[PDB]
Every structure is written in C-alpha cells, then in structure tokens.
Amino acid sequence: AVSKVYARSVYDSRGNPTVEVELTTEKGVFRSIVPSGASTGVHEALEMRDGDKSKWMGKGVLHAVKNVNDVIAPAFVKANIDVKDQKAVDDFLISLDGTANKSKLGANAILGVSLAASRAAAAEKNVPLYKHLADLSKSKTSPYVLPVPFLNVLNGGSHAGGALALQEFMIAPTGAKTFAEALRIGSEVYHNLKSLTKKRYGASAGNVGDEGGVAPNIQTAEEALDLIVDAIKAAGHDGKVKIGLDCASSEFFKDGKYDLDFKNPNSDKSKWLTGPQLADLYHSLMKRYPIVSIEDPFAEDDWEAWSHFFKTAGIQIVADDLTVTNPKRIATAIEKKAADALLLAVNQIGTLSESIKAAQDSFAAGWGVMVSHRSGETEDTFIADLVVGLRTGQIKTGAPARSERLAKLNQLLRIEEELGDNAVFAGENFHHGDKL
Amino acid sequence: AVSKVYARSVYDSRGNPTVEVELTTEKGVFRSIVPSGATGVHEALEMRDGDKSKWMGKGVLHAVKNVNDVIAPAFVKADIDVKDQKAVDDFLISLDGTANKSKLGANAILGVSLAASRAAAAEKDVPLYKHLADLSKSKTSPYVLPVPFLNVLNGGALALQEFMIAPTGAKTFAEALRIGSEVYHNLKSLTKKRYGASAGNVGDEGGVAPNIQTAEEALDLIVDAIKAAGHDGKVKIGLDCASSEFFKDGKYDLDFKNPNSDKSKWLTGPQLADLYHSLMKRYPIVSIEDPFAEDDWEAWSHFFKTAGIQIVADDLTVTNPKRIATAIEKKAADALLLKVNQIGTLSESIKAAQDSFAAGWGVMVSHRSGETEDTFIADLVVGLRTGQIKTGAPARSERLAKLNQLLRIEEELGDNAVFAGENFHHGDKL
Ligand SMILES: O=C(O)[C@@H](CO)OP(=O)(O)O
Ligand SMILES: O=C(O)[C@@H](CO)OP(=O)(O)O
Ligand SMILES: [Cl-]
Ligand SMILES: [K+]
Ligand SMILES: [Mg+2]
Ligand SMILES: [Mg+2]
Ligand SMILES: [Mg+2]
Ligand SMILES: [Mg+2]
C-alpha cells in the first residue's frame, strides 16, 4: 500500500532546482529525481518552471512540486494502485493531467511518481530494479546484456562555453570485454585527453562542460576528433575505442540552414550549410575517424534531410530531438526511415511506461536504443538499471567526470558484479544489443 | 552481526578509481565510499597501486585487496558490535598496526569504519545523523544545521586556491542554498561576460576558474556577484589559501605559477599576514583556511594574535588529534577542517572534533576535491552540531548530493533544528 507521496525541491548538477519525489510503502521510502535538459527538443513534454525572476533565476519548480503534493499525491494515495502495475500507475498519472504534452501538471511532476512507483515495486518483489524493469519490458534475462558506455569526453554546443558547434564528442570502448574494462579504458582515454587538451589549447581547456567533458575553445569538429584519436592512441587503446557524435543540430538550425558557429553572434550566414552541404561534412568526418554513431545530425523537423542522409550513412543514426522519446514521432521516423536508433530520455515523454513503449517500438522496427542522461543530472541512478533492464546494449550518461555521471557508471559496475555469468557485454554488438 | 565485509573499485568525481566498501548484516548491505584529495604530507596513507599501465597509476587494487583479504575475515571472526563505533575502529586501527595506516592503507580502513556506522544506525532504527550525534555525545535539542561554504571561484596565478561564499544571513539552510545558488549563477554570468565564454566552464569543485591576477580582483568579482543576486549583506566569504602549495625556502610566493617569479618579492610570514589583514579589512571575509604552511607553526601563531575571524586548520592538523593538540598548544588556529579520510576512521574524526570543541575551536566538516555520490559528511556535520560545512560549489552532483541531503535532513527535523547562520563558528554551543 502507498501510504504517502511527497515532492520537494532539490538541485541538479548545474545548481538549478528540480523535482524530487518520495513514495512511501510498507517496504520503505522510495526516491526518484527528475533530470533537466539544456538542448531540449521543442516537442518535449512540458518542464514546468515558475518563472519567478526573483527566485532561482526564474527556474523554480514550486508549481510542479505543488502539483505533486496538492493534486497527484492525495488522488494517488487514495487510489492505491498496485505499484507493480506500472501501466495502470502511469495510466492514472497521465489521465490526471489529461493533456498530450503533460502541460497541466507538468512532466516534471508526473515522472517522479512514475519512477518511484517502479522502485517500490522492485522492493515489493524482492528483486533488483533492473530485474523488475526487465519484467516491465518483457526483456530477456538470460543472459542480461550490459551496455557499452558512450562517454562524452569533449563537450561543445549548449553544454560548454566556446565556439564548438557540435554538442557531444563521445568515445565508446566497444573493443572491451567487460563493462568494468570499458570504464577503465574510457577513464584512461579521458585523462590522456585532458592532458593533451591542456597542452594543446591551454590549461583552461581542461576545465569541463556540463557533462564532464573537457571544453577546448575550438572551431571545428575535425579539431575535436584529432584530440580524441590522439588521446585513444596515447592511452594505447587503438582499435578498441570508437567514436560517437551528438550534433544537436536543432540548436543551430536557422532559416532552413545550419549555423556551425551559432554561438557567435556575428556568425557568417554565408557559411551556413544546407542539408546536403552538412551531409557532406559528416561523410568526410565518417571517412577520417572511427565514428560508429551520429545523433541528431539534422533538425527536429528536418525530415527530408534525415531520410536522404540515412540512405547512405551505413552507421548508427540516433534520433533525439527528432523523436523526443515519443512513440508517435518514432512511428514517423520509422516510416520515413530517418534513423535506426532512439535516444531514450524518460523526461522527454514523462512516464516510464511511455518510455518503455518507445523502446519496444524501436526494437520492433530493428532500431537500436541508447538510454540517455540529461545535461542537467542528479545523484539519481535510475537509467543505469533501466539500460540493463531494457537490454539495449548502449548508454550515454556523461564523461567519466562529475559524479552525477559516475553515479550511473558506478551503479553499472555494481550490477555487472551482481549479474556475474548471467550477463554479456554488448561490445561491438551495441547497436542490436537487445537481439543478443 | 556482521557476516561480510567487501570492497570494490569505483570512480570519484575526477574519474580516478577509489575504494567502495559494503558491510553486510541482518539489516542488509551498507555502503560507504572513500574520497580522495588533490593532500597534506601528514595525511594518513592513501594507498595507490602505481601501475603505470592501469588507471594512470592510480589503481586501488591493493587497498581493495587489503579490505577483502585482510580486514574482512578478521572483522567477521571478531563478532564486533557495529553500534560500538569505538570497538569497531579500535579493531581496524589495531589490525593495521601503524601510526599513519600505511600497512593496509587509510583508503582501505575508512570505508569499513563508515559502513559500520550506517549499519549501526539501521540496527537502532535511527537516521544516520542521529546515530552520529549519539556516537559523539552531541546535543539534539535542538540540532544545528550548517552554513554551507560554497566554493564558487578557484585559483591558484592568483595564488589563493579557494574563494567561497557563506549565506550566513539566511534564516534556514534551504534559504541559504537558494541564495548560494543564485549568487553562483550570477557569478557565472558575470565571469563569461568579463573573461570569455570558456571561463564559465567549471573546475574540479564546480566553481569557475577565470584567469585572474589578484585576490582583490577575485573578491571584487564575488562582491559584484553577491550584489547582482541582490544578497548583499546576507552573504559572507571564506578562503582556503592552501599556502603550502606556494611555500618555498621559508617564504611564500604569491606568483608561484610564474617560473621566473621575482624571488625578491617572496613574502615572510609577517608579510603575508599583512596581505590577509588588508583583504580582511576590505571584504566580508569571515573565515580563512591554511593561511600558512602545514608545519609553519610560528607563522600561524603570529597571525592568530591579531586575527579577528575564524582561522581554519587543514593541512596543518590533517584531522589528527595529536596535531590538533599541538595547534591548540601553540594558539595557531581556532577551527578544524574535518576530513575523515585524513585520519582514516570515524572514531578518530569524532575525537578530533571533540578535542576542537573542548578547546573552543570551531569545526568545518569538509569534502575532498575528489568526491563521490556518498553523502556521509552531510549527516556527519549535523550529527556533530558544528554549524558549518564546505562541500563544493552548487554544481556537480558530488557536491549537490551533500547539500541535497541537508535539505532532506532539515525538512525531516522541522522544529527540532536551528540554522547556525551568523553563529557558525560556535555552532556546537548554540
Ligand atoms: O541532447 C542530448 O542528447 C542530451 C543528453 O546529453 O542533452 P540535453 O539534456 O542538454 O538535451
Ligand atoms: O584543501 C582543501 O580544503 C580540500 C577540499 O577543498 O582540497 P583537497 O581534497 O584537494 O585537499
Ligand atoms: Cl566555545
Ligand atoms: K594489532
Ligand atoms: Mg538535447
Ligand atoms: Mg541529443
Ligand atoms: Mg589539499
Ligand atoms: Mg583546504
């Protein structure tokens, strides 16, 4: 029985308020925290903010919290839905709000209750969270599949001060044999990268972006990718570490064009690229560097550019702002063959149930699924258990720096240990990890 | 009954491996993680593998092994009562058998020490901070909630390492944190405006690190930030000089990042003190940590004569009751920076705090620069009733995890807690 549901304000990794929910049963008190994006897709479910300029830079979540405590809480406690029944739980919450985009209560009011319920269920059942999430998703547990970590070791775009347009430069130790090995290798590459970055672009280059990657003030990707390929070599993990990009191209899509200097107020509109032109630059990058995944190469509604690029890409193409973990928009992307991987970000859609549906739909269409953090993260570790539960074989939860990232990576360490011989490391099979 | 003690490697906020310990009883499995400094020469031994081919030489396999291979079987055989933190840490301390914990390693022992206290709280069915109050014979009516010292700016051209803000003017911790976060964001905005976008990217502790020449420029910047946020008069400043970092040939080099620093312009103890006093006169500074080197006793004592604000010992005392006794003897400082992993056990850490308090000292509980998702010090600072803590800027969740835990503690305690505010120095005496 759910005796209590309670929400408070806490702080994310950028020092902005966000919603924390506590769900009390006889099994104890269960806590989930909602993350917060910076490069948020326009189609994402509502993140409700106070916009009281006198408090928290206008970023209060008092209203969201109040919606939990004054609206959802009493109705949820009164109903006492079986927490084990995630569908009915999320069913209830979504109906309480009664809008498509969760704009009545706010996604950041509902998600906390959704996630906390699933934690409570796992306890009731006497099973690890990833196990219960496996159950929820009807995923195979024999073996489990452990994810390749995609480590955003070099931050640009809206995640770091500097010229670099593309948002995330990730390394993916697919050549590793275990997660633990992959994390060691990733940390070694990161440290070697940090040293080379300082030497190459100055000590200040070694300071980190929002997601823990070094933040050199450089103008082009090709400059970023040189640093990483040099770092991989220096760490002596050549051929065992691939690269992944999040372009977050929606952040510099303007006037049907793409601004590769969008953080320059004096950017040259002459040198803004067309879809084609941009497609060209990517293909050059793909040719020169060991890139195995590219996320949001084109804009959240630039469907034609996705379709045309995907035709001849030949690597994993991840939809993020395109699909915003929305089963509706995933259906479109599948139809148009715009991508073959989904970025799963639970607070984009606002319930676990909906997030699991998006995953299941993607897998069914032969997509991959990369579970993701937000750039605004917390000490919450839910997506570590999620990626394992969902058997996706790939996650991206930050550089190996800043503990809102390490928290997830550490939790994955612990899960791999627990699972022992009943887990495989997805490694080179990350794309179709579920099919393993 | 403790039925297993176990250790694994995990990664700290800088992506370096560290020791995580799990202690198992009939109440379940209880977890503690060891932090890591970037360290006083007198600190208990942090044991690293030094295998250049692994983790940049920073592996902790040996320490983990020491937990699993040496401490673990003996501890279990010992049938220790985790409720008795003293018996716990005496066993551990005895097992290692060395003054500075160099046989098994400080980072092997501390995890067991902390996990035991978590297990003890559970057995008693009390919150951790409550158990820690009991262990330390601290008053709980009311509890005292800490002022957060937030590390918003870092140095080290400008030679001073840490520049913190302390919302002592707040009426609750919750209000303190909000005010702190607002100042921090305003400072970040001003920094990028004044020193370029890249200068907004954070350091190891989540603070900004603009290329600044002088302390004054760093303090003026912070003053502007506090004003911009509209909290002028409600927010004070704290400093961590980490002067050992620029202590050379019996002198202090304020320009110790310049290879050709004018050696003739290196300061004497009395000279540096003159600088601090000028800074202290012009800015709302209410606390200064390690203003002199970790064995420059004469320099501390001299300064302490004329200083009118809290003077914290860190590298000087390294949370060691033996060195704190000296510091008290010499009238070198009047506050202890409590870093549990500097001495290695909870019991010695509590002993250090108690010796400090008994000598009229303050105690600032503190993180290390390499932190984890572990939130022990949040419960510890409340348990010890010290009234002040420093656990990072309000960014990076190895910092926020602690400050969030304090929000929860404050909410839980309701009317049975006071915010130390202006009275942080003698918070324990509140
Ligand atoms: O774009 C992304 O993929 C996410 C995760 O890194 O970032 P943000 O939460 O800022 O949108
Ligand atoms: O000197 C200090 O005060 C500590 C905490 O800031 O730093 P470090 O853990 O690197 O010793
Ligand atoms: Cl006193
Ligand atoms: K002994
Ligand atoms: Mg985004
Ligand atoms: Mg993205
Ligand atoms: Mg130090
Ligand atoms: Mg210090």
PDB file of N, CA and C in Angstrom, chain B residues 80-111:
ATOM      1  N   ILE B  80      32.136  -8.209  16.118  1.00  0.00           N
ATOM      2  CA  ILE B  80      32.074  -6.818  16.602  1.00  0.00           C
ATOM      3  C   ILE B  80      30.655  -6.248  16.531  1.00  0.00           C
ATOM      4  N   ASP B  81      30.361  -5.432  17.527  1.00  0.00           N
ATOM      5  CA  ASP B  81      29.065  -4.759  17.651  1.00  0.00           C
ATOM      6  C   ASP B  81      29.139  -3.380  16.994  1.00  0.00           C
ATOM      7  N   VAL B  82      28.591  -3.262  15.802  1.00  0.00           N
ATOM      8  CA  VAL B  82      28.740  -2.060  14.988  1.00  0.00           C
ATOM      9  C   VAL B  82      28.177  -0.835  15.702  1.00  0.00           C
ATOM     10  N   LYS B  83      27.260  -1.062  16.638  1.00  0.00           N
ATOM     11  CA  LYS B  83      26.742   0.023  17.466  1.00  0.00           C
ATOM     12  C   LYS B  83      27.858   0.673  18.277  1.00  0.00           C
ATOM     13  N   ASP B  84      28.910  -0.097  18.538  1.00  0.00           N
ATOM     14  CA  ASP B  84      30.064   0.389  19.283  1.00  0.00           C
ATOM     15  C   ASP B  84      31.161   0.868  18.340  1.00  0.00           C
ATOM     16  N   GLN B  85      31.000   2.082  17.822  1.00  0.00           N
ATOM     17  CA  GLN B  85      31.931   2.614  16.833  1.00  0.00           C
ATOM     18  C   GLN B  85      33.364   2.584  17.349  1.00  0.00           C
ATOM     19  N   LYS B  86      33.523   2.761  18.657  1.00  0.00           N
ATOM     20  CA  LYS B  86      34.850   2.755  19.262  1.00  0.00           C
ATOM     21  C   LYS B  86      35.502   1.381  19.146  1.00  0.00           C
ATOM     22  N   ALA B  87      34.736   0.337  19.447  1.00  0.00           N
ATOM     23  CA  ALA B  87      35.240  -1.027  19.334  1.00  0.00           C
ATOM     24  C   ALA B  87      35.563  -1.374  17.884  1.00  0.00           C
ATOM     25  N   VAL B  88      34.725  -0.893  16.974  1.00  0.00           N
ATOM     26  CA  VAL B  88      34.938  -1.069  15.543  1.00  0.00           C
ATOM     27  C   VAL B  88      36.290  -0.517  15.110  1.00  0.00           C
ATOM     28  N   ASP B  89      36.540   0.750  15.429  1.00  0.00           N
ATOM     29  CA  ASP B  89      37.681   1.450  14.844  1.00  0.00           C
ATOM     30  C   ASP B  89      38.971   1.088  15.569  1.00  0.00           C
ATOM     31  N   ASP B  90      38.850   0.763  16.853  1.00  0.00           N
ATOM     32  CA  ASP B  90      39.970   0.202  17.601  1.00  0.00           C
ATOM     33  C   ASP B  90      40.444  -1.105  16.978  1.00  0.00           C
ATOM     34  N   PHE B  91      39.498  -1.972  16.623  1.00  0.00           N
ATOM     35  CA  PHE B  91      39.851  -3.184  15.890  1.00  0.00           C
ATOM     36  C   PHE B  91      40.596  -2.845  14.603  1.00  0.00           C
ATOM     37  N   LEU B  92      39.966  -2.012  13.784  1.00  0.00           N
ATOM     38  CA  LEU B  92      40.574  -1.650  12.498  1.00  0.00           C
ATOM     39  C   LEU B  92      41.979  -1.071  12.710  1.00  0.00           C
ATOM     40  N   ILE B  93      42.041  -0.024  13.514  1.00  0.00           N
ATOM     41  CA  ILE B  93      43.313   0.660  13.806  1.00  0.00           C
ATOM     42  C   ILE B  93      44.371  -0.348  14.276  1.00  0.00           C
ATOM     43  N   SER B  94      43.964  -1.220  15.181  1.00  0.00           N
ATOM     44  CA  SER B  94      44.864  -2.253  15.726  1.00  0.00           C
ATOM     45  C   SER B  94      45.343  -3.171  14.599  1.00  0.00           C
ATOM     46  N   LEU B  95      44.427  -3.579  13.723  1.00  0.00           N
ATOM     47  CA  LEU B  95      44.731  -4.550  12.679  1.00  0.00           C
ATOM     48  C   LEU B  95      45.837  -4.045  11.760  1.00  0.00           C
ATOM     49  N   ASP B  96      45.799  -2.752  11.452  1.00  0.00           N
ATOM     50  CA  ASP B  96      46.792  -2.149  10.571  1.00  0.00           C
ATOM     51  C   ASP B  96      48.115  -1.931  11.297  1.00  0.00           C
ATOM     52  N   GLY B  97      48.033  -1.459  12.536  1.00  0.00           N
ATOM     53  CA  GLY B  97      49.131  -1.514  13.476  1.00  0.00           C
ATOM     54  C   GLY B  97      50.142  -0.401  13.294  1.00  0.00           C
ATOM     55  N   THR B  98      49.899   0.505  12.351  1.00  0.00           N
ATOM     56  CA  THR B  98      50.835   1.594  12.089  1.00  0.00           C
ATOM     57  C   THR B  98      50.204   2.951  12.386  1.00  0.00           C
ATOM     58  N   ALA B  99      51.044   3.934  12.699  1.00  0.00           N
ATOM     59  CA  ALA B  99      50.558   5.255  13.077  1.00  0.00           C
ATOM     60  C   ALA B  99      49.737   5.884  11.956  1.00  0.00           C
ATOM     61  N   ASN B 100      50.247   5.780  10.733  1.00  0.00           N
ATOM     62  CA  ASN B 100      49.676   6.512   9.607  1.00  0.00           C
ATOM     63  C   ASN B 100      48.919   5.578   8.670  1.00  0.00           C
ATOM     64  N   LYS B 101      48.590   4.391   9.171  1.00  0.00           N
ATOM     65  CA  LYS B 101      47.756   3.452   8.429  1.00  0.00           C
ATOM     66  C   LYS B 101      48.377   3.107   7.081  1.00  0.00           C
ATOM     67  N   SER B 102      49.673   2.813   7.094  1.00  0.00           N
ATOM     68  CA  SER B 102      50.425   2.588   5.867  1.00  0.00           C
ATOM     69  C   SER B 102      50.513   1.105   5.523  1.00  0.00           C
ATOM     70  N   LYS B 103      50.163   0.251   6.480  1.00  0.00           N
ATOM     71  CA  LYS B 103      50.189  -1.190   6.248  1.00  0.00           C
ATOM     72  C   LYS B 103      49.029  -1.623   5.360  1.00  0.00           C
ATOM     73  N   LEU B 104      47.818  -1.214   5.727  1.00  0.00           N
ATOM     74  CA  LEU B 104      46.627  -1.605   4.982  1.00  0.00           C
ATOM     75  C   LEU B 104      46.119  -0.462   4.110  1.00  0.00           C
ATOM     76  N   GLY B 105      46.439   0.765   4.505  1.00  0.00           N
ATOM     77  CA  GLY B 105      46.020   1.946   3.772  1.00  0.00           C
ATOM     78  C   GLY B 105      44.817   2.618   4.403  1.00  0.00           C
ATOM     79  N   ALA B 106      44.869   3.942   4.524  1.00  0.00           N
ATOM     80  CA  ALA B 106      43.729   4.703   5.024  1.00  0.00           C
ATOM     81  C   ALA B 106      42.481   4.450   4.187  1.00  0.00           C
ATOM     82  N   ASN B 107      42.661   4.231   2.886  1.00  0.00           N
ATOM     83  CA  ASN B 107      41.505   4.135   1.995  1.00  0.00           C
ATOM     84  C   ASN B 107      40.938   2.720   1.997  1.00  0.00           C
ATOM     85  N   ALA B 108      41.588   1.873   2.749  1.00  0.00           N
ATOM     86  CA  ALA B 108      41.002   0.543   2.947  1.00  0.00           C
ATOM     87  C   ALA B 108      40.199   0.481   4.252  1.00  0.00           C
ATOM     88  N   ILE B 109      40.728   1.141   5.255  1.00  0.00           N
ATOM     89  CA  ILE B 109      40.133   1.143   6.604  1.00  0.00           C
ATOM     90  C   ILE B 109      38.891   2.047   6.757  1.00  0.00           C
ATOM     91  N   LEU B 110      38.984   3.263   6.266  1.00  0.00           N
ATOM     92  CA  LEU B 110      37.881   4.248   6.398  1.00  0.00           C
ATOM     93  C   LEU B 110      36.553   3.687   5.881  1.00  0.00           C
ATOM     94  N   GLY B 111      36.488   3.024   4.765  1.00  0.00           N
ATOM     95  CA  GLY B 111      35.240   2.514   4.221  1.00  0.00           C
ATOM     96  C   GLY B 111      34.523   1.593   5.192  1.00  0.00           C
TER      97      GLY B 111
END
